[PDB]
Amino acid sequence: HHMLRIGLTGGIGAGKSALSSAFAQCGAVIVDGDVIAREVVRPGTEGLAALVEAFGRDISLDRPALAAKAFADDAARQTLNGIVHPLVGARRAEIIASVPADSVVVEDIPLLVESGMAPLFPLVVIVYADVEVRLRRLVEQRGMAEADARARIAAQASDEQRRAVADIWLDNSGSPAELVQRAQQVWNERIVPFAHNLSTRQIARAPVRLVPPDPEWPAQAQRIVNRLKTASGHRALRVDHVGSTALPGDPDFAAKDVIDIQITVESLAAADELVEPLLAAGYPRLEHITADVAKPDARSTVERYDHTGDPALWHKRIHASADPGRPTNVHIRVDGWPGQQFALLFVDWLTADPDARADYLAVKRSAEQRADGDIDAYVAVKEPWFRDAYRRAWDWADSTGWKP
Structure with missing residues (x-):
């Protein structure tokens, strides 16, 4: 395919999924690898049945039970990936084939910064938020214990490492309506002309x-x-x-x-x-x-x-x-x-x-x-x-x- 692709990431609690939805409300195509991975292992799917053969009925999917066998055998991880990753690839390709040809594809990749994947994209958007805001959101709107949230936050990339690889550095410390407005501003002022210029082979x-x-x-x-x-x-x-x-x-x-x-x-x-x-x-x-x-x-x-x-x-x-x-x-x-x-x-x-x-x-x-x-x-x-x-x-x- 020949569409504009945008990498999207951000630390836990910063609003990655909210910003993805805001871009979708502008007409972007959202490719979410974690969503697709959970979808290809749903009840009745070929992928879920395949894993039952490879690991038994010990596992709907008991995801902690599966990662336990994948943490130990080290070849079980290889079997698991050989099952799941081709199904994810097929689904992603289907998604891309089913949307208008002028689409912009936004890819939600949570480990984009940690694994050095930013250079794969023509443009990277990273959402961030004040640590106190992220904490309030995780504890009070997701149930996490405070110390658990803080540890989970600390175990990821720093905001400085994110900033180093962000083409667009987007602050989500405010209200949801403010995020939708900010995302549409970036859509209208940067993403729309970027995609149009690419499609007509024009430069800025x-x-x-x-x-x-x-x-x-x-x-x-x-x-x-x-x-x-x-x-x-x-x-x-x-x-x-x-x-x-x-x-x-x-x-x-x-x-x-x-x-x-x-x-x-x-x-x-x-x-x-x-x-x-x-x-x-x-x-x-x-x-x-x-x-x-x-x-x-x-x-x-x-x-x-x-x-x-x-x-x-x-x-x-x-x-x-x-x-x-x-x-x-x-x-x-x-x-x-x-x-x-x-x-x-x-x-x-x-x-x-x-x-x-x-x-x-x-x-x-x-x-x-x-x-x-x-x-x-x-x-x-x-x-x-x-x-x-x-x-x-x-x-x-x-x-x-x-x-x-």
């Missing part, structure tokens, strides 16, 4: 306005880097945060609010193999951009591409995010070619040279002032500066023995 562009550095750019970029590594499979030799948002945070600096990433591949054929998995991960291709602006006397730390005059070595591919909440450029460049080397060098050079950073900032401010919202005019005003910046960066690289 950021404004031309410079902003002060965002302290959250490193965490956002790590989520993106991980997602793209997973999507690229064997084809990404390396994946790197580049461009102005990759510089060390300096409040006196400024940049356009778009995150640039470079995927290094071994050839343009491999780049072309990335179209479908990058689209599934949230990044349509810009079909008519196939090169950077060439510079003469092109440079590389890889000898066979250094001091070359072949224009073909400036070719590339470029994708961008369809998610209007996180504009992102994804440049796909060939290992050792001049554009691939320069994207990495530019970050290291500007990190080491404050005067060059100041020069670049002044150029950007002039471009913003003269462009007055027009992206093309902004690009045109900036572009001549990159010729001298290219020469200076490579002078610095030669002097310091820079290697990527």
